[PDB]
Amino acid sequence: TYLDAAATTRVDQRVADIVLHWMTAEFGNAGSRHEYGIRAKRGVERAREYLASTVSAEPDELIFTSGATESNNIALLGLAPYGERTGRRHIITSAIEHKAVLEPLEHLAGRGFEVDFLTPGPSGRISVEGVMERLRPDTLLVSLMHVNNETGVIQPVAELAQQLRATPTYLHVDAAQGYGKVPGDLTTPIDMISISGHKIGAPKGVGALVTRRREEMDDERVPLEPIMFGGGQERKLRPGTLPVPLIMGLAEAAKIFEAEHAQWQVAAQDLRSRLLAGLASTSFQVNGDQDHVVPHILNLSFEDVDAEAFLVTLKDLVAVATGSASTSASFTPSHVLRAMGLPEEAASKSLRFSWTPG
C-alpha cells in the first residue's frame, strides 16, 4: 500500500524530507536553542559515523566540508607544510583531474613543489605502472580521481592504494564522481578521499574528507595542517559552522545509494544501452575505455557531426531518457581530451552526457 506522491525530480524525496525536517528544526520552535543543539550534535555524529562506515573508516577519520572543492584543497594544500618539513616535494597526479585538484597542485608547483601531470592517452584511464614508474623515495603524494567526471572512465585507485599503502607516499582520491557508484574501491586503504554531496543527490554546499590513520606511524592520521583558522570544528581542519541540514542530507543520499545501488546500476546500464544504440548510426564517437566506465556518464565527440545533426540527436537522446531518468549535457573543457591524445579540432568538440534514474 503506497500512499505517497512523487514531487521532487532532481533530489530524491527522502533526501529532500530529511533536509526540510532539519531546517525547520533549525528555524522553528523545536524546543529551545539548547535542546536543538543537543539534537544537532548527535545528528552530525550519527552522519559522520554512518558516512565513515561506507568507506570502512572510523568516525574520527572523516570531516565534513562545504564541497569536494574544499575537501580537495584541505587534502592537498594541507599536506604542503609536512612536505617542506620532510623534504618531500614530489607530487604525482593526472592531467585529467578536475580543476579542484589541478589548480591547488599548480599553485604548489609555483611554490617549489615538483608536480607530474600524467597523461592517460585515448583510454582515458591512468595505469598503475604509469604512476609506480614515477614513484620516488621522496614522493609526498599521489592524487588520482576515482572516476573522471567528463568521461565516466574509472581509474585504478584501488590497485594503487594496495601498493602506495606499503610506502611513505600518501594517496589522495577525488571520489566526487565515484563515491556510492563504485563502493568497493573506496573501502581500500586510500589515505584521503574527497566526497561531493550533490554528485550523489544531496544538496549543493556540502562534502566530506576522509583522512585515514596509519597504524605503524604511532597511530597518526595524515599529517595535515589547516589552511583556515578560528574554531575547533572538524578537528581544527575546517573551522566555522557547516549547515546541519545539508550534512544530514549528505548522509541520507549516501544511505539511499548504498541500499539501492543494484537498482541504480541496472536502470543506468539499461538506459546506456538504449542511448548507445541510438548513437550507432550517427558518426558521434564515444571517448574513453568502455570496459572501465560508470554506467551513467557518456562522453561523445561530435568532430565529424554537422550542426543540424547535432541538434536532432541531442533531442533524440533526451527523449530516450525521458520517463526513466533526468539528463545533463555540457561541453567538455579541451584540456581533458588533449590529455587523452586528441588533436585540437576534436578535443574542443566533445559533449558530456549523463543521466540519473528517477
Author numbering: 2 to 359
Paper text:
DNA phosphorothioation is a unique type of epigenetic modification which occurs on the DNA backbone. During this process, a sulfur atom replaces a non-bridging oxygen atom of the phosphodiester backbone of DNA.
On the other hand, we successfully crystallized the C327S mutant of DndA (referred to as DndA hereafter), and determined its crystal structure to a resolution of 2.4 Å. In the crystal structure, DndA forms a homodimer in which the two protomers are related by a two-fold rotation axis, similar to other cysteine desulfurases IscS, NifS, SufS, and CsdB. In each protomer, there is a PLP cofactor which forms a Schiff base covalent bond with the amino group of Lys200. Similar to other cysteine desulfurases, DndA uses a deep surface pocket to harbor the PLP cofactor. For example, His99 uses its imidazole ring to stack on top of the pyridine ring of PLP, making multiple van der Waals interactions with it. Moreover, the main chain of Ala69, the main chain and side chain of Thr70, and the side chains of Ser197 and His199 hydrogen bond to the phosphate group of PLP. In contrast to previously determined structures of cysteine desulfurases/selenocysteine lyase, in which the catalytic cysteines are all located on flexible loops, the catalytic cysteine Cys327 of DndA (mutated to serine in our study) was found to reside on a β strand. The distance between Cys327 and PLP is about 16 Å, and the distance between Cys327 and the presumable position of L-cysteine substrate is also more than 10 Å. Therefore, a dramatic conformational change is needed for Cys327 to approach near the L-cysteine substrate to carry out the nucleophilic attack.
